[PDB]
From a paper:
To determine whether [name] uses the same mechanism for 8-oxoG recognition at different translational locations in the nucleosome, we determined a 3.6 Å cryo-EM structure of [name] K249Q bound to a nucleosome containing a solvent-exposed 8-oxoG at SHL + 4, referred to as [name]-8-oxoG-NCP + 4. The local resolution of the nucleosome was 3–6 Å and the local resolution of [name] was 5–8 Å. The general mechanism of nucleosome binding and 8-oxoG recognition by [name] at SHL + 4 are similar to those observed for [name] bound to 8-oxoG at SHL-6. However, [name] binding induces modest structural rearrangements in the nucleosomal DNA during 8-oxoG recognition at SHL + 4, which includes minor groove widening of the nucleosomal DNA without significant DNA bending. The lack of [name]-induced DNA bending is likely due to the inherently bent conformation of the nucleosomal DNA near SHL + 4. Despite these subtle differences, the final conformation of [name] and the nucleosomal DNA in the [name]-8-oxoG-NCP + 4 and [name]-8-oxoG-NCP − 6 structures are very similar. This data strongly suggests that [name] uses the same general mechanism for 8-oxoG recognition and repair at solvent-exposed positions throughout the nucleosome. Notably, the structural changes observed during the recognition of solvent-exposed 8-oxoG by [name] are incompatible with binding 8-oxoG proximal to the histone octamer, as this would result in significant clashes between [name] and the core histone octamer.
Residue numbers in the entry:
A (entry chain K): 12 to 76, 83 to 325
B (entry chain H): 34 to 124
C (entry chain F): 20 to 101
D (entry chain G): 10 to 119
E (entry chain E), F (entry chain A): 38 to 134
G (entry chain B): 21 to 102
H (entry chain C): 13 to 118
I (entry chain D): 32 to 124
Write the structure that this text describes.
DNA sequence: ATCGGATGTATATATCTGACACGTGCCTGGAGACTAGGGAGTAATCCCCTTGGCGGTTAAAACGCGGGGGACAGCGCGTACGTGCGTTTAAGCGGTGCTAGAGCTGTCTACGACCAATTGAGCGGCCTCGGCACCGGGATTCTCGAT
DNA sequence: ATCGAGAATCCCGGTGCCGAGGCCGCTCAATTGGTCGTAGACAGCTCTAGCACCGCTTAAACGCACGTACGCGCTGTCCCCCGCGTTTTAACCGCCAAGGGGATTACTCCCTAGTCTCCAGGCACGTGTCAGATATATACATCCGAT
């Protein structure tokens, strides 16, 4: 079964990390990644760097674990990179708090909300399933998508973990029909269609991976081409999988936050409600308010707004 | 503009092989066919709604024929309809 | 189960009372026969449609909904029942 | 290969268009789905009514010594038949005129 | 032996039957008539009581309207008593024929 | 010095106007009246000639039917002339108020 | 177009229509009554026709709209499209 | 917390139910957002008119209930409602009291 | 079976019109059937305009046009005003 | 009863002509093959709603029997409506021009889409006390016999 | 035009009885969630059909004179419908029983929407061409004013 810090002590390794720098309960189930489950209280399990892990935290430490031994230093580095631990969240909160008193009020109660370094492919298809949907359902869809087309890893209790599907697999024959039976709705077409476009028209995996060196403007532009990947989805990918920290996804949540917490309204736009023009404006508004890491500040308020 | 002009002209040759028809009368027959089509289709839709059925089949087309067309005309019309459907199914 | 000679069931006092509700002051003797005829005609017209509606639904009884639909088809549109 | 295209109107021996009626029915949002036999049934009914109307109109035209059908002949055909009058009592035919009838007492002393 | 004016009782009757809203036709004979009409179209046919009541109400309304129209026809003829001429005129003008 | 009796050429031209199928109302007065009626609901409406012709034919058929029913009302009261009373009567039974 | 166009239907036009209708003798008081009736019918049709045109976001009244408005009142008209 | 559309539009007839029947009734494959609200508002106005007139008629007859006689009387006395409902009978409704002039005694 | 109707809604309207007036079951049935009839007429005509203008959807202006076609006289004016007020209030949420 | 004058149609013939009928070009709506899934046909059930019977009471239908009053036939009159005609006018008919809107195209802001949680009103079950039919009584107003 | 007996009608209070409405249970029905793809709203643009205007011509309106037959008033005649009293009767209400069919529910299957790939049936377009309009000339059908 799933390990716990108390049951198999000699299988866990720690990483210096204070709760103020990271709160797993505020990051893993908040719609950034849809692959983590709190199988046991305060213990989150999921696939990280092609293998299963269980993570749990004390006050100043982040504890990590057919493994038959404690995580190695090399493996632990995989975890630090996933949580981008070289970035000091305390410095970011300070800055955002200094230029936005509302953020300061919220930030006092929701510390440790950071951003996850992610894999481009997993991020692209997970968010293609994020559109017009709720986190609870999205989570299920992504799980069934991985069980059906992803590599089988290991089994803990009655849970069999799977790696994320490859481009070749998602581009396979009759994938759409299969995903519709798995309840993906119309997004089933989007997944099939986008895998093929990338493989048969954009120059495969290399095309998506190269975007990480490209500019936010370029990257976002490149992604909008893919079926199911309009402005909100593209920004999600840029921010969470392509290292574009200034990218700010604009969904219904950030729509409401802007309105009630900043009394914001479109000025350059023509429509009075969400539209491709107003959404783009809201994004710049947040960028001019928080700066270069505006997307990360967005992640904090989004996570906090989920707790309502 | 989709019409029934050539079809009515074809039927006229069957009925009176050596009789002409004016364009005004052609338009009137066109409008008449459209009106009777609208009546039968709408009333068969009412039957479909009333029986909680979502398919317009020949049974309620026949019921609509019996409801709208008068007495002796209805017998001949239903006979023609049954003959046509039987010929279609057999062939 | 044959029913014969029931048009006489529409009694003369009933026709008198209906005419009174219609605001008629004096009634001739032929009016009773004439109104029996027109009532028979109107009931045949309604029951033809009602029985067709019943036959369509593969039902062996005439429900009130069928009568309401038959009346609305002819342009009567009786409220209340159903 | 494909076995050549033959219209369903020829299949059922009709002149009126089965496929056109089917298209009108399905894009006329009359029901969620349309059965196979319904367009053929309705096309046959329309053909029979048109044949009746045209036959009566042709008889009226022949009795008027004209070889071309005009709306006056259609008016005579519709209102000289008792049942057809009942079917189309609530319609007006343009350029149709009125059937000739005069009340009895209007006629002069015999 | 006091006796009324022959017309005054009639107008009393008018007021009495325009004041209230009862059926004015016996139910069972009307039901028998309806079943007799219905047997010729389809033998062994059952009737719901609500359907019979609906038929009776509709027939009463139709006859009341017809009597009102034929009363107007009679009055137009400088008369008081209705004639079958009046009823046939009412049906012709209305369009039932 | 030859004259036809009253009701002879009056009885005639009934056959002539039932024989013909023309309009019997001048086009331009009906055009002006239709535009006059239109200007009340909206100012400066444009009218196709086909629309005015359709209105003319509809109104003319309506009036022909009304005059038939008026003749029925007049012949009912043992009259050969028609009076407006006939018109209100025919409208009242027809339900036109 | 402005005023006094109801006199456009002169006495002989009404006389001719009544002759077509089977009327032999016409009292003097008929013309005014039938002018009023024609006005009522024409406005009751024009209101619906103009409503159709206005909903169509047009400024020209088509014959098709007049036909449809006539169909709404139960006076179906044939010969001007369907 | 959900805020229902009827209360959002200040209406009592259920906007959601009118919308459901509009979609299911097969009138068009797409139904706009505001059309069911407009329909519900029109139904509100008609129902309010007919109930206020029926209540006036009921109080006229010293009656605290509404009976089909009240509804028929209210419909027939009003003009525009009568025109709207010119081709309808009301079950158990009776007739409006009306006596022609020549039938009255001299 | 679950027979739906407008009985409770008519009762709510009645309470804000005549707060102290009862109503019988027969009258409630008549009112429900009246609501159904008016609904079916208006919806039918609104859909009918959609075909006449080749429009594939029903918006709030087809309903207004149908009301102007059906309701006679001042009912049309007041119903149009009520509908416009209601849709304006719904949009200005 | 009848007879020709005179209108008013019926009938027959020459001579255009513009709607009618035909062939042709072309494309777009119809057709053939194939697939997936849900509307619908079919079997079992229960319960309930319909039919039928039976009997007692009596409101109501049937029927006779005046008698008055309203339908109705006949006669007179005077006036309002027809027929005919000279005069006016405006309705078609035919151009000619103006142009504002009708209709077809090319771009981008409001609904459909999949459906699962999420309440939360909306209907079913079930009291319950009050609105109102009914009775019992007495007083009021209409109605027709009398002067 | 009143008086007044007498009959139909209106007002007041008591009685009880069932149903309109309130309350609770339970349950499906709008509502919404990290949006995006997509049809309708809008601007653009052509061109045509609707508007105005004028001149010519002649068919229709019409103002008027005149005669006559129709509507209307008035009358007496008579027959037939209504009020009323008496005599059946079968409608109605209450109760009871039996079972036919009509909602239901579960199950399967096959008919049809959707889609891809064609192709010829039918819609513009052009052109001969004769049925019918139309003018002309004769035949006779029928009112009708005497006769």
């Amino acid at each position: 079964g799933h390990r716990t810090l108390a049951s198999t002590p000699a299988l866990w390794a720690s990483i210096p990390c204070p709760r103020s720098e990271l709160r797993l309960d505020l990051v893993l189930p908040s719609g950034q990644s849809f692959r983590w489950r709190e199988q046991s209280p305060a213990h989150w399990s999921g696939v990280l760097a092609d293998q299963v892990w269980t993570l749990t935290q004390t006050e100043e430490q982040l504890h990590c674990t057919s493994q038959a031994s404690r995580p190695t230093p090399d493996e632990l580095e995989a975890v630090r990179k996933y949580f981008q631990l070289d970035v000091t969240l305390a410095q970011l909160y300070h800055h955002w708090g200094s230029v936005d008193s509302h953020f300061q009020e919220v930030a006092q109660k929701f510390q440790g909300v950071r951003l996850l370094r992610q894999d481009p492919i997993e991020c692209l298809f997970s968010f293609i399933c994020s559109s017009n949907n709720n986190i609870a359902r999205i989570t299920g869809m992504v799980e069934r998508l991985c069980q059906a087309f992803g590599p089988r890893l290991i089994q803990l209790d009655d849970v069999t973990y799977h790696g994320f599907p490859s481009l070749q697999a998602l581009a396979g024959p009759e994938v759409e029909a299969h995903l519709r039976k798995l309840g993906l709705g119309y997004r089933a077409r989007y997944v099939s269609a986008s895998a093929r476009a990338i493989l048969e028209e954009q120059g495969g995996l290399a095309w998506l991976q190269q975007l990480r060196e490209s500019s936010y403007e370029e990257a976002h532009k490149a992604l909008c081409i893919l079926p199911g990947v309009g402005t909100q989805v593209a920004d999600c990918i840029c921010l969470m999988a392509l290292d574009k920290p200034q990218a700010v996804p604009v969904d219904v949540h950030m729509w409401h936050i802007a309105q009630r917490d900043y009394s914001w309204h479109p000025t350059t736009s023509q429509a009075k409600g969400p539209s491709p023009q107003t959404n783009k404006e809201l994004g710049n508004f947040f960028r001019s308010l928080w700066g270069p890491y505006a997307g990360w500040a967005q992640a904090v308020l989004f996570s906090a707004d989920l707790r309502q | 503009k989709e019409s029934y002009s050539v079809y009515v002209y074809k039927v006229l040759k069957q009925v009176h092989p050596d009789t002409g028809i004016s364009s005004k009368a052609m338009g009137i027959m066109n409008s008449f066919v459209n009106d009777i089509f609208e009546r039968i289709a709408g009333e068969a839709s009412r039957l479909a709604h009333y029986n909680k059925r979502s398919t317009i089949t020949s049974r309620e087309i026949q019921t609509a024929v019996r409801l709208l067309l008068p007495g002796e005309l209805a017998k001949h019309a239903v006979s023609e309809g049954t003959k046509a459907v039987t010929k279609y199914t057999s062939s | 189960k044959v029913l014969r000679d029931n048009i006489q069931g529409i009694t003369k006092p009933a026709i008198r009372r209906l005419a009174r509700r219609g605001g008629v002051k004096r009634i001739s003797g032929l009016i009773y026969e004439e109104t029996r005829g027109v009532l028979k005609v109107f009931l045949e017209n309604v029951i033809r449609d009602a029985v067709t509606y019943t036959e369509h639904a593969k039902r062996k009884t005439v429900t009130a909904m069928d009568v309401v639909y038959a009346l609305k088809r002819q342009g009567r549109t009786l409220y209340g029942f159903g | 290969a494909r076995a050549k295209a033959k219209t369903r109107s020829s299949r059922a021996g009709l002149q009126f268009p089965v496929g056109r009626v089917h298209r009108l029915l399905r894009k006329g949002n009359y029901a969620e789905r349309v059965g196979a036999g319904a367009p053929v049934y309705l096309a046959a009914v329309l053909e029979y009514l048109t044949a009746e109307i045209l036959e009566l109109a042709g008889n009226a035209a022949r009795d008027n010594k004209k070889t071309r059908i005009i709306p006056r002949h259609l008016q005579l055909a519709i209102r000289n038949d008792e049942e057809l009058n009942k079917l189309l009592g609530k319609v007006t035919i343009a350029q149709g005129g009125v059937l000739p009838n005069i009340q009895a007492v209007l006629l002069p002393k015999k | 032996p006091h006796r009324y004016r022959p017309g005054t009782v009639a107008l009393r009757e008018i007021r009495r039957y325009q004041k209230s809203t009862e059926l004015l036709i016996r139910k069972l004979p009307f039901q028998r008539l309806v079943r007799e009409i219905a047997q010729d179209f389809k033998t062994d046919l059952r009737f719901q009581s609500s359907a019979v009541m609906a038929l009776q109400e509709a027939s009463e309304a139709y006859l009341v309207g017809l009597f009102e129209d034929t009363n107007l026809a009679a009055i137009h003829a400088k008369r008081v008593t209705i004639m079958p001429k009046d009823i046939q005129l009412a049906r012709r003008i209305r369009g039932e024929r």
